[PDB]
Design a binder for this molecule. Sequence first.
Ligand code: FMN
Length: 379
Amino acid sequence: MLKLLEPFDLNGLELANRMVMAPLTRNRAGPRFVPTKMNALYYAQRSGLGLIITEATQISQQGMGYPDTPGIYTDEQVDGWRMVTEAVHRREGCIFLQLWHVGRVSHSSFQPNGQLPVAPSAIAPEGEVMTYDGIKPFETPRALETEEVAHIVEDYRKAAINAKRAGFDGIEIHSANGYLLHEFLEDGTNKRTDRYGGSIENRARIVFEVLDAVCKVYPSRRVGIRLSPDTEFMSMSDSDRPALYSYLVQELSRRELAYLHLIEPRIKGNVDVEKESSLNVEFFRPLYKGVLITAGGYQKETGEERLQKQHADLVAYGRWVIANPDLPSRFEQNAPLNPYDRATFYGGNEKGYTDYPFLDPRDSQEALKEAEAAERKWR
Ligand SMILES: Cc1cc2nc3c(=O)[nH]c(=O)nc-3n(C[C@H](O)[C@H](O)[C@H](O)COP(=O)(O)O)c2cc1C
């Protein structure tokens, strides 16, 4: 009787339920940003979620701002992701790769040749950024030349080519949470005078060009996109978020994409914030035609209310899913939720990653089995 637990049809994909694993950076790639068997166990374990969206995956070295995130720009990376897609599919799961460019939220230490991070405009985020050599202040990033936006779009297109080859069911363009695309959208970050700055239309141009480029690799019904309609995460700010997001959503409505993925203002990236905003999901449901994913601070009961009230079609869970590989079964049988441990979110090993327990140990055995089979197959 939970709507969260109703199978849902995603323009062809037979989702087990209406619950989504939110994208989650775990900082556990192998050398050269290549996914490993351990990574496949983790996704295999969580494959009773209707849809998995992966951790943000950089489309290029230039797009990375945190250590040991996986990439999707080399063959060796694609091979690694194949273990992941295989294992999730053997468990009858569905999965999309979230494509990432960190923008200015990076450090020369991460960059090819120790070049500056790139952004719309030469404006550093506030605060400090973890690097290979400990905590350092954010640097002023380099403002991208007009001509270079084309080359970033092409990175996304190559990245989607690699994704399709890796065997992902679809892709999600990360346009949220303070990163390259988001910096383009908001006029607090975007001070450009060319055809990608100024007018609301112009700021979104890049988002539309990325979408044009990837929908040449995947059918548009397999391209998703994530927005953060109203957040301070990473020194974001816009002079008029209602106006900017209204336009951006209505345009998106007409591109017949797989879904729109909206993060609730009560999330500041990875933590909860007290915050007044009307730019939550209720405000966008009217403005977006197709399949709508709501994410951010939900529980069983508040997620269920979203679906009953027809506010969204899918509810994403991030932190609960880190801790509860079988969240849907727990919801379903009214079980206690395993607590999540923030200290093991980022970096590390099995601990706080693949060692959260299931209701049913057999689920656990089946994930291990598929993940080992996936490794032998793609050895
Ligand atoms: C450890 C951690 C990693 C995350 N990584 C990503 C990411 O890679 N991409 C993204 O778009 N959001 C990311 N988020 C934001 C979450 O996807 C989600 O919006 C947030 O956790 C709020 O959802 P929740 O309340 O269910 O946890 C992350 C959050 C956490 C706590």
